[PDB]
Amino acid sequence: HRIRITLTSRNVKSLEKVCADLIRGAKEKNLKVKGPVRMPTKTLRITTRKTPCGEGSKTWDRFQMRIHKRLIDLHSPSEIVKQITSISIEPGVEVEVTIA
Amino acid sequence: SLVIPEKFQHILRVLNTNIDGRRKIAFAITAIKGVGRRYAHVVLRKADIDLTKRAGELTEDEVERVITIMQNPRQYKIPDWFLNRQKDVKDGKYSQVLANGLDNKLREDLERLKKIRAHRGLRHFWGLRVRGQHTKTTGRRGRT
Amino acid sequence: MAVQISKKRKFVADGIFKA
Amino acid sequence: KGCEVVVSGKLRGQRAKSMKFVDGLMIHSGDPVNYYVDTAVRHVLLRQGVLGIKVK
Amino acid sequence: TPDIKLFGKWSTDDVQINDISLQDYIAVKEKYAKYLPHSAGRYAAKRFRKAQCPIVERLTNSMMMHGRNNGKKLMTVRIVKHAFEIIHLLTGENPLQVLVNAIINSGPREDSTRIGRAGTVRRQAVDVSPLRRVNQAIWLLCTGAREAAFRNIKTIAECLADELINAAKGSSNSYAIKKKDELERVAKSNR
Amino acid sequence: GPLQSVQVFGRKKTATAVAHCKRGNGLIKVNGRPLEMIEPRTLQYKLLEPVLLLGKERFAGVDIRVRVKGGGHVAQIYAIRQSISKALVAYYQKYVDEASKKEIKDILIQYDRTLLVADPRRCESKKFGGPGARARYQKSYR
Amino acid sequence: KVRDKLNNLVLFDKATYDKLCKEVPNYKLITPAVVSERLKIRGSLARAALQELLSKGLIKLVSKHRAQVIYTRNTKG
Amino acid sequence: GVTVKDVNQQEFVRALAAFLKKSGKLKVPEWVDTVKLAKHKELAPYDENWFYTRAASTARHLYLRGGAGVGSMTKIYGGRQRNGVMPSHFSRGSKSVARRVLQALEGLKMVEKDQDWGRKLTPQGQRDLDRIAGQVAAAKK
Amino acid sequence: GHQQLYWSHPRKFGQGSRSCRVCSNRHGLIRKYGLNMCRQCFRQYAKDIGFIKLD
Amino acid sequence: GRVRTKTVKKAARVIIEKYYTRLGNDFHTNKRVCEEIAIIPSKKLRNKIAGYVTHLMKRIQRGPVRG
RNA sequence: ACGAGACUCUGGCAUGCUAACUAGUUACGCGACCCCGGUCGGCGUAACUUCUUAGAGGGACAAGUGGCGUUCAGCCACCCGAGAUUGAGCAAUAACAGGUCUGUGAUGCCCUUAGAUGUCCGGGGCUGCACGCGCGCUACACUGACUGGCUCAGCGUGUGCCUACCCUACGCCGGCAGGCGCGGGUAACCCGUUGAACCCCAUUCGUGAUGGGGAUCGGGGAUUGCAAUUAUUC
């Protein structure tokens, strides 16, 4: 059973914390764990005017969001990796499970 | 060859207009009202006349064949979408007009619009723009 | 399920749910 | 260790005024403003008009 | 084998500078000698770093003006190379020597400054710095070739070619020499 | 048998030109094409500059295979010209005596600094209120 | 300030042909621009005449380009 | 040992045009005289037999990259669109002339259809292209 | 025919088929990534969405 | 213009006050000293502290200072 | 004590560290073409991070040298050096009768509320022209125009709640604008190696309101939508 788990979040430091904890857990559980594949991050750029009406110097904002996505690959049966993945999930980090 | 040939006709009198002979044959025939750059290449491709010669050294039989291609272009296998006047409101024929049918048919279409009293005809009679563009900022050479 | 919105729209929907 | 309250609106008259009460320390520039102060704005509807509250 | 930095097919050696005031500002001899008149950059960063630029590169950079020609470095380079072809085939003289002697002969050596309020005509005679001599010389050569090659049948590879040799012999049939000596005449008129 | 291989890159603006130095005959091929066969042909001598300054006998022992992508045209020319020189310098430094690397490096930096050190110039970000990073829109009074 | 609107001939008359054949191979620099200026002919006509003289072998090629070409006379020795 | 990758393309395409004119089994279209090659073009080409040149350049591009269809051919031969007063943009080529080029290059035995998309060169067509490449190299030598 | 002519007008497409989902106005809508509001409401509620004006 | 602020000079003065026996003339050694002893939220500030401490050591090695 | 600075983001380098069949490199085998050796973005799999992705740390500080300065703060030039002034973000007290009641179910007062200033349907108008002003686009050409061939990127975005309307490889038909059955992507996988333009090369043009310039206007054919006329667009 080849299994893929995706660690997609908005904040990056809690993402590094949970990915390091998952890699450490797969290391201590005597399991063949692959390295964390770092996908190219996606920048959310939409610009708008400052003032609500139409007068003033034409000044704009640059609002930004960065979403980071990570990949961890394992070779393990289903129930043990469910038991691993259902431990200590952050509210700002979303995990999703896929099977090949 | 590059020496001037005998009876090198300078001024060409074709279809009661003036045509220079010093210009290229793909461009000297474009001085006739009604024919332009794109349709000139097709005419000299249907007729077996090369594009590398000036208009001043061609003779009666080749210019007569080109005039036949001018007057009756349909049965020399010129495609129907290449024409300027298609699907007539008077008789419904595909034809190419050379300044006389062109001028009198444009005049007849304008008087047809002015008689039918469409707003295109009223705008042509008043002397304004018909294609629906802004007149507030442009068209300052209308009247004094 | 047959909608499957993309990964940007999921975070946009979650933030606007919070708002 | 630092606070700032701002009120603005009808304060005993027709023309609106603005009263500021600052005591302590207050950072105004840089990213420590993004994570050392909390800014809340509310609207207060009175009988004679609407009054504004700004607390930092 | 890099025996000599041949400028395409011309040799950057055996070229004589006649003026000593322009000795350290024109770099064509044995250090700043390239195969192309196109280098990388970082040459207009500090104050006097443009004095180390090759003179043919400065001519190539000043060749492009008037909107539709900005940035086209390849096109100005091939104008420069073709102009060097007519210069070598026209006089029998090395083309780098013709470039050097024209810039010395077309350099305005005295200038007048606008002084006073706005509208009043007062000029005060000053002399021209040697870097500014080369700078206005290159600008004058470029604008003379530019206004020669405008609405004319003669190409810019030939209009640039006739403009330097008329500046090299000082025949004053060129436009750079014309503005050079009327500027010297204006500076001489009120001192 | 062992293989002698170093893999050296080079940049101008965004183009990355990665060379490959293996032992063999004297030939330089970029993208499978020789140096005399790269558009534009006006910078043919700019292409042939490092092998001309360092001689053909120094290049006679190394096969050169460079691929390049990114940038425009002149940036790609400058990138591959940087990569060939840096690859030869790194190959002599890795395998051959260091003294010959010092002698070639001295004349290479004496000709031009671009042949070994990349140029730190990128396009600055566009701002609002103007068509570029510095220019502004035309201002009207009255 | 004379205008002098040029009216270049589209093909050669008698005097232009032998004037070219006696004077053009006796000049230093030959380009279609200077041929059109000296012989008051068209630019493309000068190009055709120079191609004919190149095919005849009395003019050597120096450099060819899509903008202009460079031609010179033979050595008199 | 000389290949297509070390042959100058400018002489190569006209040599291929001469070779395809000499072969003369390409079933050229009837409307080759009255057609515009792209909608960003303004006049017809002055060369009357451009079909051989276009098929030659198509065969060269199919050597350089495989799996290209009719849509990839319209992107290669694109250019600037001058609409007069309008600011210029990029406009692709015409689909039917690329279709006719690939039917001609399939009807003559040079190209078979690639699997599931595009087309690709026959090894005999690779032999022909490399032989004429060696011919151009020997002519230049 | 009040029922069949009350709102027989098709608002299938067009600008008025969509509206602001905060304050229900039809001017200056942002449709990118499915926000579906005007610019002022996005600027007022942009902090809880997570958009920061770092650039 | 590179003129140091008052917090840099005050911090450098007090760190050369309370700690002198483990300082030297190398910029990197007392840079690591300032990193280890003083808690500083950044790197450029610590770097400017190290540079001004090095300059102050070079002037104290010549003569006394009034601060 | 605030402001400046300090702080954050991005660019500029690190052959050192962590890692990659949703990124490749180097070797090996097979296959294809040619004259013994070259090409493959053809196929498949033994190491690796040199390219790519992005995480932690490092690196530049007036640090060194020579001067100027009360020899104090600092300034100038040079060497080693990827940089010895990269660009942005945030931005104090005080007030403006500055703009927004047409961003809001944020809002006081006033007006109106069934022959309505709420609302809905159908049509029109916001585009209407003696004229003036501002922001912009194309040009006045031969450093060019047309026609063929060669050839090189980076930010992005993509099947939506009422809400139906996505991006597109591939095959045929047609000059073209376009049309039909076919496959992928809910995205580093598919468009895509985003065969972009300016440039480069080779013909045609030759100082002529000209093959510059494409305004105005006639006829015809497709697409979107319930509907184009005051020409939607092509």
PDB file of C-alpha atoms (C1' of nucleotides) in Angstrom, chain A residues 58 60, chain F residues 125-138, chain K residues 136:
ATOM      1  CA  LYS A  58      -4.152  57.069  -7.123  1.00  0.00           C
ATOM      2  CA  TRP A  60      -3.169  51.067  -4.205  1.00  0.00           C
TER       3      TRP A  60
ATOM      4  CA  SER F 125       9.389  46.341  -9.699  1.00  0.00           C
ATOM      5  CA  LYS F 126       6.802  48.578 -11.341  1.00  0.00           C
ATOM      6  CA  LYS F 127       4.951  51.019  -9.085  1.00  0.00           C
ATOM      7  CA  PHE F 128       1.499  52.548  -9.278  1.00  0.00           C
ATOM      8  CA  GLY F 129       1.107  56.033 -10.698  1.00  0.00           C
ATOM      9  CA  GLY F 130       3.633  55.440 -13.469  1.00  0.00           C
ATOM     10  CA  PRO F 131       4.459  53.268 -16.482  1.00  0.00           C
ATOM     11  CA  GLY F 132       7.705  51.939 -14.995  1.00  0.00           C
ATOM     12  CA  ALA F 133       9.771  51.616 -11.831  1.00  0.00           C
ATOM     13  CA  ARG F 134      10.884  55.265 -11.978  1.00  0.00           C
ATOM     14  CA  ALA F 135       8.778  57.170 -14.522  1.00  0.00           C
ATOM     15  CA  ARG F 136       5.419  58.734 -13.671  1.00  0.00           C
ATOM     16  CA  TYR F 137       2.346  59.727 -15.647  1.00  0.00           C
ATOM     17  CA  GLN F 138       2.122  63.234 -17.075  1.00  0.00           C
TER      18      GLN F 138
ATOM     19  C1'   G K 136      -3.866  58.446 -24.033  1.00  0.00           C
TER      20        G K 136
END
